[PDB]
Ligand binder design. Structure first.
Ligand SMILES: Nc1ncnc2c1ncn2[C@@H]1O[C@H](COP(=O)(O)O)[C@@H](OP(=O)(O)O)[C@H]1O
Ligand SMILES: O=[N+]([O-])c1ccc(O)cc1
Length: 295
């Protein structure tokens, strides 16, 4: 009721970055967020594998036992730093204040507005990047179903906004390059969604090592089995089916939508693809960061 006036509103702006309308009021709760050195941040541009990696991390911290990951939904096990639903739920920052170390913190904030406390405390950041074409498709369908978002209109107009960095959380180009460069002065494990599709066990192993956790072969296989797309799609703890329909209309588009690399080929027109490829090449010249659009 009270949150309704924030839903389906145009983006607000915080520190020059487009922001979900409901999340933007009382930004100081974010700017002044009190982190701990043991915090683990799962940071992504939206729709790049946040939930996937969050479940992997929580599974690793539970020793590979899926029962401890079924006791609550992932939205509560891994709170989103900047989440807010004024008048209906506590903010993510308030929920995190009460959680025991090691806290797992999800965020989509670009590196330059991630709260300074994280950088000062050297907090381990696991960043996940995904190729921009698949991200755009996933984010468009997410905005169709998620009522916190401004309505995206048609796909062609959404794609123009995406390429120009007008969507919530800003420019994908700036986001992925910012955390790629920031690893110079901070402990960051920079993962690729496409690598995880190619060889999930290889990436789980890298996450475990970054976190200092040793996995038996049995625990590694258990985590890989429980973090397949099919498993996470059918798991009520990870598939977001417990979110009220007035916030996420799962009938419009499910959260666990397709889970592949290359769905952009089913949405980009021949013209859109050529135009996107030409712009992307200009915007990504001068970084060594590279993404795969097919595996
Ligand atoms: N175990 C998994 N394996 C492969 N893809 C997964 C996955 N879990 C979620 N995904 C996909 O990651 C996207 C959600 O990303 P995020 O958690 O950052 O919001 C969605 O992509 P699609 O819309 O392309 O299906 C979701 O289907
Ligand atoms: O991950 N999330 O829950 C999100 C991501 C993007 C957004 O605009 C709102 C919510």
């Amino acid at each position: 009721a009270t949150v309704d006036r924030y839903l389906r509103q145009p983006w607000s702006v915080v520190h020059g970055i487009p922001m979900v309308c409901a999340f933007a009021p009382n930004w100081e709760r974010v700017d002044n967020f009190q982190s701990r050195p043991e915090d683990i941040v799962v940071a992504t541009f939206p729709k790049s594998g946040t939930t996937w990696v969050s479940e992997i991390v929580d599974m690793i911290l539970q020793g590979g036992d899926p029962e401890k990951c079924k006791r609550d939904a992932i939205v509560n096990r891994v709170p989103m730093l900047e989440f807010a639903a004024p008048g209906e739920m506590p903010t993510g920052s308030e929920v995190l204040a009460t959680m025991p170390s090691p806290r797992v913190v999800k965020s989509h904030l670009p590196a330059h507005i991630l709260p300074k406390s994280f950088w000062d405390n050297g907090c381990k950041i696991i960043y996940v990047g995904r190729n921009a074409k698949d991200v755009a498709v996933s984010f468009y369908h997410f905005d169709l179903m998620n009522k916190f978002e401004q309505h995206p209109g048609t796909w062609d107009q959404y794609l123009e906004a995406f390429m120009a960095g007008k969507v919530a959380y800003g420019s994908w180009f700036d986001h992925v390059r910012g955390y790629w460069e920031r690893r110079q002065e901070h402990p960051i494990l920079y993962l690729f969604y496409e690598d995880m599709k190619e060889d999930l066990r290889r990436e789980i192993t890298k996450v475990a090592q970054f976190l200092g956790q040793e996995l038996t072969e049995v625990a590694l296989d258990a985590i890989a089995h429980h973090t397949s797309f099919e498993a996470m799609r059918d798991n009520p703890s990870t598939n977001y089916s417990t979110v009220p329909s007035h916030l996420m209309d799962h009938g419009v588009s499910p959260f666990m939508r397709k889970g592949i690399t290359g769905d952009w080929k089913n949405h980009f027109t021949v013209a859109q693809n050529a135009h996107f490829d030409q712009y992307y090449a200009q915007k990504m010249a001068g970084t060594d960061l590279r993404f795969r659009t097919e595996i």
